[model samples]
Target chain A: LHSLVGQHILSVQQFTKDQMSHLFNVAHTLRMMVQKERSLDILKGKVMASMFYEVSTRTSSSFAAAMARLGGAVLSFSEQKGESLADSVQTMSCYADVVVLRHPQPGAVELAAKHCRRPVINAGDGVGEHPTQALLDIFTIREELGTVNGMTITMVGDLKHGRTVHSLACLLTQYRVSLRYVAPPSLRMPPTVRAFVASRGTKQEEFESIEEALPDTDVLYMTRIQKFGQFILTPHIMTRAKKKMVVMHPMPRVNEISVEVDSDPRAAYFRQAENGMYIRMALLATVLGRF
Target chain B: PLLHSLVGQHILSVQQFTKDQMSHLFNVAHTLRMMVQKERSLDILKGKVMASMFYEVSTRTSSSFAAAMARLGGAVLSKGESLADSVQTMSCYADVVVLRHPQPGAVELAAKHCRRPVINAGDGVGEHPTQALLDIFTIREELGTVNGMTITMVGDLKHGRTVHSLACLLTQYRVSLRYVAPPSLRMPPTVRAFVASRGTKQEEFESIEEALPDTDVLYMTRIQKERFGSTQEYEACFGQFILTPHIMTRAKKKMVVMHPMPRVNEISVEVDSDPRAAYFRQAENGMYIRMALLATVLGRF
Candidate 1:
């Protein structure tokens, strides 16, 4: 009965370290079950709503695939006919067991959650927070880096508007860690955010280049730079970074991350994409219980 | 068709509706409003699903249909894609579909392909059957009759599907229709001939100012940016056709103002507070009317 009862995931700020770790543990167990080809239909007879107001690829789709894998059906919305975000929320809440929403408005996901009778999962809300993205990111780091503790993780690219990094920074605070934010001054993490992380006892360093932080970094997370509403990844930036640093990006890249980096053994971004399936499986199981 | 009919049907156009159908729909809409006002949990459509397939940018119509479906105890599955992609893929998963497309005849095209009953929320110039129903119902509730009243269709009549459909449906009753539009945006000749065949009195005027005095309902459309040949043309004609408070001074106090919305500067913001302004109420009525439609189409009614 405690499974996802009266639950709404709006931000990583609301998650305690223990709850975050609990999700990771669940993901790990689910991953093993998937590897062993076992049935984990914890969400049998349940339905999930995938409502994305923004153009999406991995976040919305992977969550949907995860729901289906766990024996639940997914209702997806891609704005095919100009349905307002609020209307979609109002409608889907009546029909589905839970809903995952991704919208361009900053507070829209949370506002939508207030209206829904069922659980509302924030996929991405403007520059606010993507708690699941944050949780899964921490999951990815712990899986690849062996531990999330004591590692100096370097987050590259647009921090100001990049919700993935904003969510990542908040979740990383759960661990005993240090953070180096790499970005041009125009795109650095906001001062209020930097202060919040400092309050949480996590040390943070800011830089434009990857040079200083790259050598000690155990996990290097990159975001696709958006240009003309398109993803762009540049190769020249990768040559300056440490070879041992595992490269990751939540993508739709239009040349922001160097194409050459894809060949590197440390490129875990694609794997990160695949990891969404497992993490979402764990999430659905955690929320709906027992997948 | 029987009054209890509309079993497993798709409400695609007003032309498909008979007077008896509207009367049955009105009864259900009255009940829907009561259920909502009481803060009731319908749960009637629990486990039932509605998919919204939008091929255009419509915040209002989409929300209206979705809210109606939800309130009726149905779920919504929204698919994002080209019209054809959503029609082909989403039809497999949903029990019903609310389609709003920008292209003329697009909704009909989808309704033909979909396995589930496809409700045309709005199709380009072809028809917006739901809007027509809501508007007609609103007129009956507010002014007390649909017949023997003159409706002045102002703004861009050249491409206003809502106006066209409403005009066609009003033909079922005794009515006087006035067409108020600028020279570059006159009502289509095809629509004119259709109105004539209905043998309803028709009057064409060059502007809203000329038609407002004799009008009981002022149905204004936005300059319809989609109708413009270019942005420059849109910029040139937008301001001249707007409905404002100063203009409302001349309108009959009992006269109603309506628009199929997402309005852009065409209706004065001040006019929203006026009792005669029925746009928001019309939008609200949309939910109940659609509830009636969904119930009928799903054979629940």
Candidate 2:
């Protein structure tokens, strides 16, 4: 198994198939332990500097909760600032065992991480990457499918700027999977990402509409949109999708998935969010050298 | 005499601390400071979480309290909203709460609602219990004793909540208080009456020079620019209360200069080089003071 000890989880590219398998098992065990013990002492005496310069509702809360559930402390501060990002990260790193940083500018977290003394798990850096989300996405898919084999996973909405899908797209290339991109021309996946996945022999297709992609798409990962039912999921929209599909959203979504569709067994976004906590717990324990 | 342990007590005011209790608090603060000096990490409050809620922002106090908890191997929750239930709900997630509200009596009311011990980081112009605690602690740490020291506080004392609490806390010690500010910004009558009721002598000074040689601690707090009717009036008040190296020359050689910081032109940059400049040391003392407070209240000490 691969060791995540003292590692900076900046990009999903850092993960390989074996390390992910190891992480998922750790995540699975921790989830069960949380059910049994409610809280664990594995990370007692440890501190996480959870710096969210650009607020990510679930990612920020999940990481903090993950640290707390493992008996670790989270030190969070608002970036109502007085210094450079490097200086801020370095100062926080001095007090923390690990740093979970989220910023608005692309490559900003990476730059700050370079200057930091402690390992930084990049929460999100502009349109850069959301590595933990990708890991949680794959983990959620594997659990739902009960395996990680070839199956078309369709992603919709704002692919160019959706950091999670970009990270997820890169991450799924490590597995034997088929991929579909359902986005507008302006929000389509970048060509460089297409090249990288192609080189890895992952069959990829781009569909003009989510309707065509929805029919057989094994896992539906969506991010942004609004206005009731366009890119939104109504029970009506879910009927067009595969009966066996998993409907996921890296949420804080704005009317993207209607409340009516929540009754469907395939509506796994909230479950996907819970997987985020487990994956975060797994990631934190691994980097803290406790896993 | 046996001292009452601070375990499970909310730090609200100087009125809450008896002489014996202050002694117990400072002794623990000194121990924690030395332990940190030898090596940084002191895991006394490991697994404990402190919810830091502030109505007003101060980069110094907010992060100072946060870093103090982090150094002790504990956690801090720094951002939140609403009040009463917001504060009550915050305590549900953490072991303790540290608060600074812009409204007077807001923190007092919050402590009443909160399940955890609540620290008055500052509550409007009425009280700032922790800042005063750090101020008093810094005084004793620097001067070797608080009983005989003369603390000369200058600046916008009328609105300066810092000196208000400091004077009240110092009433427990056998100390003299002197105030120097523009006539409009003289120390409040309530604080003066409080000090008088305790039998601690306080004198208001028109000149920084007359009180300089006898002072043991020169406490300074910033005068907000908006407190004046005009920019010219505020600028004049700034110059009148400003402490420079020349003013330091008149002060006792043994005395320490202090500030509840974010100092402006009121304290000269040149004055920072003086060995007696205790403002920076005073800021550093906040962390140790908070560490002691956190440990004691959480029953870790």
Candidate 3:
């Protein structure tokens, strides 16, 4: 509800154009400095608490590395152990300037942040908006497509619970970009997001297959389907997609993209992993400010 | 920071200490080690409860930290329960905590929730300040000073929180650092950035073979298999840095070889007999250094 710098970055919908630009600019600076072997001391003397209630590999480590890279000490806790989320949240604020929280329960990040004196970056909230990941996705699209203004973005995967694509959809509304929701009827984009995007003026195209949209689609954002009980990745489904589309996934994948797809030039997920360091380093420095 | 001054405080990681604190601890530990050697009463820590809440146990670290508190006239309560619940339970009976957990920020969580001071024994790949303190203490005791020594830090620097914390504390000194490891196991960027900021000269090489000629102290660390992205990567890099007698020949006469023990294959068993191998001596020092920390933090001399 508040601004980005002084505020907790929880939802992509919360970002204004000016704030997005501010975040992008900081990301740019972080990318350049790290490349030059220079230390970004913007967060010197500051501290961040990484409180992850869920087990995450990419998001958690990148946040800690970003904090340290910006010269800030971090008090981290993967919420898998013996502590409750609330106790960890309140306690982390006692010794830190900010807390980056990722909990499995929805709105738990907000609940924790409300009790905290320091800023809280919602790394993710279960199947909720991983705002930071979405931001990186947005930045990636902008970088690849040159602009989000006229681009057609094809979003693939579970729309009901995958909070990442939800966050991506929310941020895309601020732009003039078109959206294609490629999902199974059971896995379609949530009604709330569908109506929300429709109300914002951005056009949305929902499809069960990527065949009709592939050639014309400027950006293709693929997401991994979490195996619930009997779900499987079929080869016939992958044949329906175009080779030209830029494929992206929020990682720790358990076989969604075929090994056949990896060697293709369009799989942007691995590069997405590398981009995380710079984006996060930028976020940490910008939030803490250059001293 | 004085052990006398830091009494009643948490001895979280070894990185928070100074060289003066390390040496002062050496004198105190020498006294305690001799006392234990002589069957002296451990009245200093008596009755004062020290609760150990560990998720993943290292018998050496847990036992050493507990022994320090017990030898100092304090009591110890250990458990394999939840970190928060264990801490809360300990708070009802004990005065302080020496916590070791597998999660990255569990200790910080315990310190915040518990009424007592929580010392971080090890928290995933995060800094281990107490281990760093003991390593530095051992280096100083063997080399006479840590300020100007060249410590050839070897093995898995990527996942070695002990080495990373040691590198951070080493920044507080004028020491030269030689990072010797395979590219896959090189020191992390965050640690390298810290060393650079502190103005300490950093030299990186692909193998320990290159750095041994100039190393004043050689510190070996195990390639932690738990952190690899794949089992193949772990198997590929496990025994790449084993230090043997021939490997030690290029070092200075007084150069000490230290390992944060339970080292798997990274150091040859034959190297243990060399006077340069100060690992056992280093292990012994963990007791005294922690005793100094507990005493100082507790407001005792």
Candidate 4:
């Protein structure tokens, strides 16, 4: 059995460089299989209960679609009136083989996993960690840039509150990649995270301006923010970047990047959303012990 | 297609079914019930997917439908998403949609917008055709048949969507229907007219005691506080139609008690252990009927 089978994918710190490589290889195969419209039934007769206590469209739908693509069923649990979270999880555990949970409170998913007999996946736990989102982000970078090593990845916007950037920063330390932290002093990366990255022996530099990092940046990852060089990444600013550099965003974007930048060959955000599905397909298969 | 096939059909109202069509459906449900008990696997809708869109909150109707789809080896797309946009997106990914909304006629509008067949789970005060179908199926399974029986319907008749649909479906066969409700919560005139037109012997009474003696089925319903116009209005009717052991003593020994559940104080929890309490069994039959419906709609029956 794969080590991920029966395991909870709770944090990026839980995955090694080797485990992540195996996931990407499976994702690559799944991407091709889905493109050819060939059905995969590795999870036939299995069921996944999707319990989202918070509002989500992309994350929930992508997981559901991934399950269906793998020949599985889904039991969608709505946040019903007057039902306790523990009671709902207990009921869902009786009904399905696996559970994907999204809740507004930090440690809510962990508490659920404690009571759940089946494998529990943390889709997102408030501002704690979105392990799947980080995995997919890494998958997108590998697909677009063809490598995650020896590259300077610039992460901009709400680094302090962005759960995705925090998880991504921790996971990127597994590789020899250098990181550029771009945000104002008010929203700088947490001291704990900065210290953790330093202990992993990965190089990191701070920049207040996107222009300063643009020429050397191999991947420009943006979360939501509004400041000069932080809010808007215009095509004119992007033109100064290396030709091979790719721009990315965990989307539902609002004014953080220019729409005109979408036409650039290096713009990889839309494809990034599509890759989210493939990476999830790989994770589902591996976690279910089918791969 | 088989005789009385539901292939590619949208179940919008109880009035859409013919007596003969219902019999064909029940036969399928009977076979499905037997198979399900034996733990037999049927992959009729193996590669098919269903989108269960509920704009209103529910537990029983939603779970039964999803379980039915899964039992048939089919998949489901369920989530809390927008109505029109979610329907459109799901139509591309799924083969059928089962919609439950809080506004009347919203399911009809969604059916019009959806590319696939749509089943109306419940559309506010409008109708819940599946619940009606399962109720009828349960009546048949419990009491041998549906013809020539006296059914006493008790509760908030004005806003109980289950009773309205069940009343309409009962009219398809020869049955005497007695509606017991408070004066303000009596059956709507249009619904009364439609049942009378179908050759059903129907009457409205304010007291359950007066209607209990000749009843073959006692269909109890909750006085929905959420559907009320005012607190005073709801308070007046909430506990007026309770079914208890004392009430059951007045009725025929073979008379069955039923409710579309999440029952508030209308039915005594003490009545639940009685042999005639078939509401829980009614819930079980709902799963089988849905299995039949899914299989038929997917064209495997």
Candidate 5:
């Protein structure tokens, strides 16, 4: 709790196992609260400034929805209009209690965090990290399977550039879980990230095809694939997998997952999308010192 | 039932606001403005969400509405018109939606599809109802009255949506309207006839020189180059009507100058320092007026 309050959620490395558990508890409570009513006034008079320098629909909307559901306001800043990132952050900090930034540059979020007087949450910083998305992804896994310990998770597609997988890979190190990476050679997980995860004592492996990892996997994370340009998690793959295996994706999916597979009980992506708002609610509440 | 008349209603045009309704809205706006000045939160709209759907690029209008909603303890969902085809879907996520599109009648079309109340921010060259409300509110606040005031509206009367909507709303009051423009950019005949039908005294003029003297409010608008086909033709009327210290000296001492800004030299930057220059105050008033409008439409005021 001390670590979360007045802290910047810039990296998955910043969260610990206990901190993660605390967040999950808050997220679970919020998930229940949202099912009863769409609006809550717990954070009334609070405001969030959502500054998306990159193009996004999911992260931006979910962040706003999270703030709104908590009975807070949002100052949505999508237009830069020639203002420097520092200038924009400073101006928005004056209006909002907290700031969520999504930029296309790796260190842009860190730079914004340095300038902002208000607590800054990194929505996504280019290929750097999307800590909130990873938190929600972990939450979805726990919610679906009832545990993260000793579970085998497979991450598929675009490992080199997908920021979600990078953050998830780092965060999973906090749990006693095994991770499998599947991608084309050009888009394979970077060795530096692999070494970092290994140092955290999580056994890891790489696969060119998902079939080898399917039978052993408890969770399957699918990210956007640039090489194949099609959803790697096809209906065919679902039929071959264990019935209990859950499939997840950081969405606004551009053909990286089959629409037909969306109806499958194993498809947890949409529910995962719904969980994003709750995790964000937990993060925002915790950061704003409301929890 | 003063505020009840606005509940679940679409604010499409200035003509939609009756004298009684305008008076009610103004009272609420004035109260909201006072509260804001003291840094008080009017949480009447708490738990409500406003979808700010701007199809056109606008920093000022969009920010004003967002700030208004925030100050009122309501949330705002802002985006350009990507998901606007699903207007009903927007209502599911928002209590009301404010739209500003570049096509005329687009907001009306959006309002038709939206189940929740819709406020028109600006719809191409058609109308900007909120802008008109704030403009009139500023007039009353700055000059002590709107009744029987002489307003000299200058520049791009044919193409400026701000002037058109302001002119329409102003006719509801007993005021003299002076339309000053180059021949190619004069006021539309339809707008003139409508003002005449409302029994407002209106006259057209070719020069700002004749209109400045007795003016109680000087409304200026940009002569948009996009409205002209050629640069040569646009240049012919671009700088014809401008408000400077030379012109301000001839105007009434109590008269206030206003522009829906993002001004491109129509009003001199030097004019901003004058006590009579109320455009910045007019922009600030927009926040309060919108707060009043949002609260009223949500049945909270």
Candidate 6:
């Protein structure tokens, strides 16, 4: 009965601000139920086939665990160099109520969605898109900072290759926000993405180093690297930053932020990973025609 | 043995695998073995899903089937509940099913209730034809043939479903069966009766030493300590057939020693280093046999 029922969530482009808002509201309700020890079986008897054609343990488990929490079964499959992507997706569709796919080829997940009889959730498709990660990133910010409105989002690391950052930046344009891109010149945000944000009327700036961006930063989103002016944040640099600014990363972070930074109350990266499961639970429940 | 075909059928007992079907499956497994040794993978079962439900998990059998399905470009789903209803739900999602449970006839009960064809990994002390099939394949693969071989099954034959299944399967060959067990743990009369009906020669021995010298394939069975009601009784039985280096001294140098493993002091660790210790080789054969069953039953072979 819902607009999204039987639809494939392949791109951030397919989501509107209202649809995103609705998904987060569902995520909030699921999160509260989990916190309060309420048993929810919205997805009772449903099956989720988690096909990680490219392995990302965190993302794959998040989706699988989400289905289990909703009172459904899970079938987990790993990568293959053989089997056509379309044939593989079609085959799994026979056994699942829904399919979550992560692959290495660009647009591979989208291609899979066409061949899938069940609704497909794009876990990630190489450099293409991980729309769910974007959903959870914004959802994480709202949960931590109390609001995303008027916040200057500082994004650091290889923005060009960061499928996560690309989707996150695109989704953030729906809000009253300004973005700071912090990366080496070779890895600058692509012009297509920059122009998309510009067309959406959100302000953006590119910085030589993260330090110059953080005084105005509300959310320090690091994909890999970092540091800022009076606001440079690391084990040593974090001392100068605003106590209220929350640091976030789409994690499995490798020394990008100091290990000591994990002790900081402002580290929202781990919380971001947790938010992902709730967001996925919300998406699975919705697309399966449940609450 | 009344098996006409494995396709569209449930493999519930050792009696189900006839000589022709058993030989067909063994050949398929051997073909898969050579392909995997060279290329390290096979995709014949690509996109197929195998549902594995284990009531009492044996880490060995469960992992073997999962890897077997995976290497053949297939997947596995293993979540168990109402042994019967749980299997019915698994049938909705998986193309084929595998069940390993601790109760007698538990596999048959679920297989009857499931839409997808079921393969019994084990059914308590009732039957374990799958293991028996692999054991038979191992005999052919290790030695050159099953016929004319004296296969000795030692230890707990009565409660060992694997031994019961193995003895039943060996009846198809023109072979001699020698069983060595304690008085109370001797091979089941039902299994011995079937062996006799097939005109297969079987002898019951009081000790492993009596059976060792003539055994071309010494198949050891695990004696569960849990089966003995009194600790004193299990203690008395413990020293009976524990295959030690000294006991193995009487064994033929050219023969192979085999066990349905996860051994509990039955086969001494000293025997593992010997080239004729084919237990690990026997373990790997389970994967290929399972891979063959999965592909053949799913119409992909």
Interface RMSD of each: 7.6, 4.9, 16.2, 4.3, 4.5, 15.8
Clashes of 5: 1
Reference-based lDDT, residue B60, model 6: 58
For TM-score, the strongest prediction is 2
- Candidate 2 lDDT by residue in tens digits, B89-197: 9888999999888887688777886788988887865677668788888888898889898888987888776677778777767998899876777898977998899
- DockQ, all candidates in order: 0.05, 0.11, 0.01, 0.09, 0.12, 0.02
Is candidate 3 or 4 superior in DockQ? 4
lDDT for B101 in candidate 3 is 77
Clashing pairs in 2: none
Residue-by-residue lDDT tens digits, candidate 6, A177-289: 99999888777899989999999999999987767776778899987644223223487767656778899998778756877888899998898899999999999998887
- Candidate 3: regions farther than 4 A off: A1-3, A78-84, A226-245, B1-301
Better of 4 and 6 by lDDT: 4
Root-mean-square deviation of every model:
8.7, 7.5, 23.7, 8.7, 8.9, 16.6
Two-way DockQ contest, 2 vs 3, winner: 2
Query: Once model 6 is optimally superposed onto the true structure by TM-score, how far is the C-alpha of residue B98 displaced, in angstroms?
Result: 1.3
Q: Which whole-number lDDT from 0 to 100 does residue B276 have in model 3?
A: 89
Rank all candidate structures by their DockQ, best first, as comma-separated numbers. 5, 2, 4, 1, 6, 3
Q: Over the stretch B1-301, how does candidate 1's per-residue lDDT look in tens digits?
A: 4455577777787877777877899988898778766756576666788888776766567656766776676777764456666676787888888888877778877777677888887777657788888889988888988877888888777777678777878888888999877667788898889999889888888656778897999887766567765677666655557888888899887778887665666777678778898876777687789888887788776
The CAPRI category of model 5 is: incorrect
Q: Alpha carbon lDDT of residue B194, candidate 6?
A: 84
**Residue B254 local lDDT, model 4:** 77
Error of 4 at A49 (Å): 3.5
Alpha-carbon shift of residue A150 in model 3 (angstroms): 0.7
